[PDB]
Structures are given as structure tokens and as C-alpha cells.
Design an enzyme around this catalytic site. Sequence first.
Site, PDB file in Angstrom:
ATOM      1  N   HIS A 312       0.861  -1.209   0.000  1.00  0.00           N
ATOM      2  CA  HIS A 312       0.000   0.000   0.000  1.00  0.00           C
ATOM      3  C   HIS A 312       0.890   1.250   0.000  1.00  0.00           C
ATOM      4  CE1 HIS A 312      -2.285   3.204   2.106  1.00  0.00           C
ATOM      5  NE2 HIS A 312      -2.855   3.088   0.900  1.00  0.00           N
ATOM      6  N   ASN A 313       0.602   2.190  -0.907  1.00  0.00           N
ATOM      7  CA  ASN A 313       1.393   3.440  -1.072  1.00  0.00           C
ATOM      8  C   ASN A 313       2.867   3.102  -0.815  1.00  0.00           C
ATOM      9  OD1 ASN A 313      -0.865   4.907  -1.767  1.00  0.00           O
ATOM     10  ND2 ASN A 313      -0.988   6.069   0.142  1.00  0.00           N
ATOM     11  N   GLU A 342       2.086   0.046  -5.466  1.00  0.00           N
ATOM     12  CA  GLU A 342       1.052   1.070  -5.776  1.00  0.00           C
ATOM     13  C   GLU A 342       1.743   2.377  -6.182  1.00  0.00           C
ATOM     14  OE1 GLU A 342      -1.658   1.866  -2.567  1.00  0.00           O
ATOM     15  OE2 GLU A 342      -2.766   3.398  -3.737  1.00  0.00           O
ATOM     16  N   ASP A 344       0.588   5.957  -6.797  1.00  0.00           N
ATOM     17  CA  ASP A 344      -0.380   7.084  -6.697  1.00  0.00           C
ATOM     18  C   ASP A 344       0.239   8.272  -7.450  1.00  0.00           C
ATOM     19  OD1 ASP A 344      -1.697   5.185  -5.095  1.00  0.00           O
ATOM     20  OD2 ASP A 344      -2.203   6.592  -3.440  1.00  0.00           O
ATOM     21  N   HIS A 359       1.230  11.285  -2.260  1.00  0.00           N
ATOM     22  CA  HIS A 359      -0.100  10.877  -1.730  1.00  0.00           C
ATOM     23  C   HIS A 359      -1.200  11.737  -2.369  1.00  0.00           C
ATOM     24  CE1 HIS A 359      -3.028  10.139   1.793  1.00  0.00           C
ATOM     25  NE2 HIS A 359      -3.049   9.079   0.975  1.00  0.00           N
ATOM     26  N   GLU A 393      -3.037   4.441  -9.480  1.00  0.00           N
ATOM     27  CA  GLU A 393      -4.051   5.396  -8.961  1.00  0.00           C
ATOM     28  C   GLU A 393      -3.768   6.723  -9.673  1.00  0.00           C
ATOM     29  OE1 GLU A 393      -4.157   5.771  -4.685  1.00  0.00           O
ATOM     30  OE2 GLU A 393      -4.858   7.893  -4.828  1.00  0.00           O
TER      31      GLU A 393
END
Lengths: 755, 317
Positions: A312-313, A342, A344, A359, A393
Site C-alpha cells: 500500500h502506497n 502502488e 499514486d 499521496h 491510482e
Amino acid sequence: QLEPPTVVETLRRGSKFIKWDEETSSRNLVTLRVDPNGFFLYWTGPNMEVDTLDISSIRDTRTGRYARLPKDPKIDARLEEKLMTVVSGPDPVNTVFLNFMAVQDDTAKVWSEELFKLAMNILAQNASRNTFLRKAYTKLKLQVNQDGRIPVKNILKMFSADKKRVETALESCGLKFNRSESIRPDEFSLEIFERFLNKLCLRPDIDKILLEIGAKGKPYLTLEQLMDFINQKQRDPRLNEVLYPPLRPSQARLLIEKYEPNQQFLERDQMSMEGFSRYLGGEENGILPLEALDLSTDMTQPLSAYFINSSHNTYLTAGQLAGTSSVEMYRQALLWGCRCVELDVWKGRPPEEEPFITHGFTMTTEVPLRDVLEAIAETAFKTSPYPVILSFENHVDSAKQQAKMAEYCRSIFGDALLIEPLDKYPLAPGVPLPSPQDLMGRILVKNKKRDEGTASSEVNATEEMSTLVNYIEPVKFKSFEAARKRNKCFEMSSFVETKAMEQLTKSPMEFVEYNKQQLSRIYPKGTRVDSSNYMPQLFWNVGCQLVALNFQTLDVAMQLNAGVFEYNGRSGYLLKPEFMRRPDKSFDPFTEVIVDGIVANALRVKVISGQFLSDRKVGIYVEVDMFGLPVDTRRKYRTRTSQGNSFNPVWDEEPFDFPKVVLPTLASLRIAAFEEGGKFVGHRILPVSAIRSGYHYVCLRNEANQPLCLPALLIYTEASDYIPDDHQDYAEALINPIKHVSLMDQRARQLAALI
Amino acid sequence: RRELKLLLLGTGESGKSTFIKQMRIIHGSGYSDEDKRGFTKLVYQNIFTAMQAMIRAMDTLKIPYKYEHNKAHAQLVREVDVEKVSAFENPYVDAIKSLWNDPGIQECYDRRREYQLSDSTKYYLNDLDRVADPSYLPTQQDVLRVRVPTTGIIEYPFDLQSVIFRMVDVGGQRSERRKWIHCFENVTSIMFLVALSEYDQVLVESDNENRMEESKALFRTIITYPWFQNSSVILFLNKKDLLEEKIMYSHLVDYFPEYDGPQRDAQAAREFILKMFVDLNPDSDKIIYSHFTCATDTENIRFVFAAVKDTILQLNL
Ligand SMILES: Nc1nc2c(ncn2[C@@H]2O[C@H](COP(=O)(O)OP(=O)(O)O)[C@@H](O)[C@H]2O)c(=O)[nH]1
Ligand code: ALF
Ligand SMILES: [Ca+2]
Ligand SMILES: [Mg+2]
Ligand SMILES: [Mg+2]
């Protein structure tokens, strides 16, 4: 198959190198080399005082263009592929860099590659208790002073658990014990180290095992008592007698000839308390069979049939709100086996036509997308050849940059990037998702095709980024009935934890159904601003494959993640249970009872003793937890704080019982050691279906699952096939039926007189 | 669709997994060229496993190798880790061809009753050329003969149109029988396999206990369990081909002395073994539908199962 870590003659002899950082002024020439066992990388500098790097703490080795460079010092040309960087640390965040520019040219490459194999070798990480001790010894022999002597103060520091007794042990072997004196390598042999350990570390726990069975005429043990012990007490009862034959007399002899030091017992096929102590911690009495740690899982089932190590991130090193974003976290995540990172992504600046990664609206530093893409093509398949997913993302409000964003993917990943579907798996309904075997060395892109956080508002899907999406095409999740009616294995949907939780409690069987053909990704909620982690076991229990976590936070969630993804060759893919894969079948994850066609297990775990658990004298307590289905879970058990020491604590407490494990094939035992106060010593994650029975050393690990050296626990386990409370009679009758039919035929024969 | 659950129970090495293959051939998706290619490795391993067991037999039984050059070939083969065998080439091929031709190894093959050796030994060793050929593709008979120990509980569903039988294959070894209780829920019928050939053999689990004595006790026990009070019982007296051969030199009266039938007789021996299993059972409740089978003979199983299909259906609706 797996191999012991061979150390090439070059790393043995050594090669000249220049050690440097960004501050070094003068050229510091050193001779690098690796001990014959591949434990430590050691170099002797200007002072003649040595520096050691534990080869098991190494995370990556780089050379050529992937190696670190400086500027100021300077050395003309650039094709100097003799730069080697060594990356080590106790977790992905706290990485330390060592640079060694070679003097001869065709060497840095050889080193960089050889060090890498030694560092990622499976037998080295899962070695015998004896080997970790022989490793401690190697450190004492390398870390010599400027006069090639072993400083006594180094033996007092290594065992600072009791400095007063250490003095007595050394004195008992006719070695120096004074803090000012040194010992010559010549008179400090492995023999004299083993003698040193035996007089320092009394083992009343092993005495109690020799008495157990049997020889009350105690000084020694017989070949039979040992063969019967290995075959009865130390053997896994779940294993087939044909597939895993028991030891023969001829094989029990080889064990005495291999471990028995007393050359007179070896003669009379007997084993001593010293020879049994050697066996207990040898390479045949490991807690786990090699088959568990090996790449032995079937890798041909659809991509949906596997649990997949996810992040995650990935770009974050600390918290979600504020903090720094890294290029290095990707390298570390991928090298650790992570198979789903990930990105983003946000939109580039007008003059600077380059999109960056961060983020969202948080004043959190950003890194260039192009720099993250390269770092992935670099590390993606260094520690695993199985496929890698790029979780996009997208927040790019630009046709140019989003196109230039696709252009980088084809350019940097090249032939690795899967741009079109496979001849065998067309993107048509009814077709299954490809094998991890089918996608070896492949980069699959997961983006739109044409407190959830910034995952609730992504931009539109352009043709450039849409022409790369094929098997992992994300889509708005409706229901399970819909995804089923639709029947598309290439259509996957993400679920923020809390959203995933609602589907878990409301439709668990319908959620498992879905996970047999389609992929589902779970990511923590936007509230966990301290990059906190949720227990992935919740979602694995409903067949969730891509259960992403915060690799920068080594809480029990990630410790369990690293634990279970050590297995199956660290491949980053674990095959789901059969009844969580087959269309034919279905069961309730909330089942408080056994399930037809699935063999339940019982687990008894008794904490017997520990060795060298802390550098400071303090009490120790051990936790024994079990993760799996909600019924198979217990985060309860804990021993009482040890006697008062940390040197050789013994525990006399009933065994911790897990009498019924519904789905043992999904359960993982957790053994964690602690100091009075809560200071984490180490732990271990063991699969319930593989964990062996009898007395076995559990070589402890840190939060990151890196192997500690001196700390260890001697535990006794009984992992058996479950038998209901009443069916114990019918069970014994099926196992040895002749005895049963021998009595009923005897009684009948004894009643013939009275007709 | 109407789904009924059958159990394949047996001592161990009786032919449960072989019966399963005939179902896959007769009512299943059969075996394609690719499927067959999936067994080559196993056929190579079985040949090594078998020649290694006979190589131990030479020492254990103290039988001399007629020819000296076979002592070397014997040391070449004994060192092979069967679990890693992925190919079958020289020197190994010429070494196993030569060992099999050694009157010493033949004298030892004849005394196979005295140690553990798989039944498909001679079948494979007599066809080495065809198996060694680098163009070798296993025939369907070659798949039906392979030996692959079964461990755990495996459900195989088969669509016989009229009905869908969920057949459950299990391990036969003693240790495997502790698991059996985890497939006893909602059972329609239990088809029990016994090896007719094992009357003069001992268990691999325990080498002083008679195999047929084991299957006999296991059968007489299992049919009196409560999970099966409403479930039919079909008894398959398998390996009738191996009994026809062996009965000629291994007398039944020497292992079962209450046999007062004539010697060198396949049928009298056959009908005696059936009586032991079905007769004078203080718990003589259920009717037992028996069948003499050769599980590696597709046309035999086709005929027998067609009958067992009818029996199961009737005794249900
Ligand atoms: N000649 C002969 N061989 C058989 C027969 N049934 C099984 N076999 C062989 O015996 C071995 C054991 O078969 P298998 O089904 O694995 O035993 P299981 O443990 O009962 O499944 C295999 O090599 C089969 O080919 C039979 O009726 N005749
Ligand atoms: F003989 Al089996 F499982 F029944 F190998
Ligand atoms: Ca995100
Ligand atoms: Mg063992
Ligand atoms: Mg079987």
C-alpha cells in the site's frame, strides 16, 4: 533444487577495493573476502582493525549503472562498471549503503552476483542451531584486534548475559578470562568453543529428555533408543509411511558416526549426552521439512488461485499524512518478494513535462514517476521470477503526460511489459486468468480501461494507458451476482478495508466464490495516518489475493506477511486451499465445526527452554498464537516471565493446546519471545500443516524475518490429524484392525463350549 | 443434478487410484497426448524404484550377480535419487537392461514375495526399449500401471448423465486411515478393494503381518460403522490377473490353513477369499454385492461398474 551456499575461490582469497562514502578524503584500499561458510563479508582497513557485515542482513547488491556514485572526490570516461554498492538493514526503511569500487575490473560484477546468491540462499536462512552457533564462533575469529588476536572483552560482550560465569567457563578450558588479555586464533578452535558453550550453558532440559526415553543407566543412549526416538517422538504422524519411510538401522548408524565425538561410543554404536545435543541442533532435526521452504507449490493454477504479497502506497517510508516519499521503497518492497506495488501518480509541471508520485493534498515530498518505473524494472525479478502488478491510482489531467506515462512503461520494461493478451487466454468471458508460470518475468498494468482516500477520485481512462491493461482491468464493483452473471476473470475490483469488512460479514461464501475466478485488492483506510496495518488474515480467509499493507510499519500484520511469504521459495505467490479454489466445492469461513473432505489437525506446543535471548540479564516470556479461520485463531497464550535470567531459562508449564484446527492448511503458528516490559527479542511464523513433531530448536527472527544468531528456543510439538472426542475408538480400529478382530475372534472361540 | 457420494476404501496398493483412472477413461475426459506426457517422468521413476528394491534384495537375500560387469551397473543405479529423475538415458538404460538380464536378478525377481516390489515391475522392465526410446509416449495401459502413492482425501466427481457420482480416493496405509473419518459424512456407498494376490505378502507398514489378513479385518470392521448403516457395500476382489499366475506356485493353504480346496486353482482360491470377507459376520446385516476385477483392464471395469451403477441407483430410489 536448493543448494548449500558455496563460496567461490575469489571471495575466499579476496580482491582489492576502495571503500568510500560522500565525506571520505583519501583513497582507503581494503581486501574484501567472505569466510568459507558465507556468514560474513569482512575487510581489514588502515588501522588493521576489522569490520564485518552479516551476509544475512544484506537486502541488495548493485553494480554498473544501478550502483551508487558520488562527484566531489572524483575517480576520463564513465563506462566504469567496477562500482559495487551493498544494501543491508533490519527492515526496508532503515537501509545502510556500503560502496566498494574494485581495483581490477572484471571482479565487481562477480562479487555483486555471488554476495547476492549467499544473501538470498534459503538453507542459510533456515540453517541448523549448530550452524548459527558455528556462525557466532566465526564472528569471534574474524573481529580480531590490530595484532590478529581475539580480544577476551569480545567474548564477555557477545555473552554479556552473564559476564561473571563467562570468566569461569573460559578458565575451565585454559583460556584467558581477563578483560585486558587476548587469545590467539590457533588455540581458539570450534572444538574449544563447543567445550566453552557446554560448561557455560548447563542444560538440565536436555537431561530431562534423555531420561524421558530412556536409558536410566544414563551416561549414554543406544542406537535403537535413538532410532525409536527419531521414528516415534520426532516423526510427523500425518505423513505416509511409503512417501516418508522411517530411518533404518543403517541410517541411524550414520547419525552416531556424524555427531558422536567420543571415538569409543561410536565404536559400540552408542550416543552420548554431548552427541545427542549435537543431533538436536543438527540439519536433520529442523522444525520444518525443506519441501515447505522450497518452491514446491503448483504454479500452473489461475492467478486468482493464489494469495499475492502486496504493498500500500509503497512510495511511503513513514506516515500517510506528511512525511517523505522514496524510490528506494519500491526496490526494497520488490526485493522482499512483494508482487503488487502502488503508484499514486499526479500530473507534471508545465515547463517540466514530467509526472511525479506522492499521496495527495498532503505536504508530502514527491519523486519522479520515471525514477520509480526504472527502480521496478531493476528489482522486479531479482528475488522472484513470478509476475509483478503495478497498481495505478491515476490523477493525470493531461493527454500528453498520460501518453508519455504509457511511453515510459513500454520503453523501460520492454519485452517484460504485457501489452497484448496471450494466444491461449483471450479476454473473453468464461476464459480463466493465466498461470503465474505463464507470466514468468512479466509486468501487468492495473489502471482504468476504455475515507477511501485519493482512490475515490481517479481521472478518465485515455487510449495510451488503456492499451496496456489486459488481465488486471479494475472496474466499479456492484455485487457478487453481477460479477458472476458477467463472468470476466480479467475484471478485478479493489475494496478499502471497511468496505471489504462489510462484504466479509454479510456475504463471506459469495466473496470466496468471487475470488475463485476474479482478483480482489484490499487497502487500509485513510484514517490510519500512521501507516498502521489491518490483519490480512481476515481477507485471506475469504480468498482475497491482493491484500496490500504498509511495508514501512513492521507491526504484527507485516511480521505475519513476511512470515507466510518466506514459504514457496519466497516466490510471493501461495496457492489457496483446494476448497477455496474448486468450483465443485464451498464451505463457511465462519464454520465453528470440521468440514467434510478437509482433514482437521490438533496442535500441542510446549515451550521447554531458551538460549542467549538478550545481552542484558532480564526475565523472558514467550507467546504462542495461531492465525487462520476465525475458529482456528488464538491470540491468547503466554508463558510466565522466566526464572530471572536470559542465558538458559527453562519453563515447566503445561503445553498450549489447539485441539481442533478446522483448516490447518490455512493456519500459521506464531512463536514470539519478549523481555519483562515488552521488548521484542524475536519470533517465528510456521505453517501448521508442515510444522514437525518432537523436540526441535526454533531459530528466532527479527520483525523483518531476518535470522538472529544466538537467540533460540527448544520447543516440543505434536501436530496430528484431528479425531473427534468420541470417534477415538473407531479411529484406532481403522489404524490397527487385526488387533481389534483378534479379540472378538478370541472371545467367540472361548464361548464355543456354551454353544 | 442428482449427486451421490461413493468411497473407495482399501488396505493400500489394492487399486483404488487405478479404479479412479478407469472412471476418467470411461466416464471422464480420458487421457490426451499432453496428459500422457505428464506421466513419462513417473514411468522413469517406477523403473528406478523397482531396480533399486531388487538391488537391495540381492544383498538382503545374499544372491550373487551371475555376471561381474553387473556389480558396477548395480552401484550406478543404487546412487540415483528417484525424486530428481526427469529423464532416462545412457548409461542408466543399458545398465538396467543388463541388470534385468542377469539370472541373479531374475532369481531375485522370483523371490519378490520375500521383500516389497511393485506389481508393474515386469510390465515396464520387459518393455525398456519402448520406454527408453527418445520418442517414447506412455500408452494408456502405461498410465494405468504407474505407481504413485495416494495420501490424504481427494474428491473426483463423474457425470454418468442419469446421476453424478462424487468418488472419494484415500490413502490405504495404516497412517492414512486416521484421516478417513473426515470423508464419512453423507456416504451413499463404500466400494472396498482387496488384492487377491496379497495372500502370501506382508504390509509395508509392518513386515510380520499378512496383507490379506489386514484388508479382511479392515473390511469386517468398516461395514459395522454407524456412518454406513444406510449405505450399500460393493466388494471388488481386484488383481484377479496376478492371482491366476501366482496361485500356480504360491499355495493358499500355506498362508490360510482353513482352505481345504485344491491347489493351483484360481477359482477355488477366489471363492475361498470371498467367503472370508462376507460370511459368518456376527454383524451379517447388509447384503454385499461382490465383483472379481482386474483394475488395469478397461473393458473389465466398464462391465463391472455398469452393474455397480444399476445396483447403487436401485438401492436408493
Ligand atoms: N496387474 C494388476 N495391477 C494392478 C491392478 N490394480 C492395480 N494395479 C497396480 O497396482 C499399483 C497400485 O495401484 P493403486 O491404485 O495406486 O493402489 P491404491 O493405493 O489402492 O490406489 C499400480 O501400479 C496399479 O497399476 C490389477 O487389477 N491388476
Ligand atoms: F496404496 Al495407496 F494411497 F492406497 F498409495
Ligand atoms: Ca492510495
Ligand atoms: Mg526428523
Ligand atoms: Mg490410492
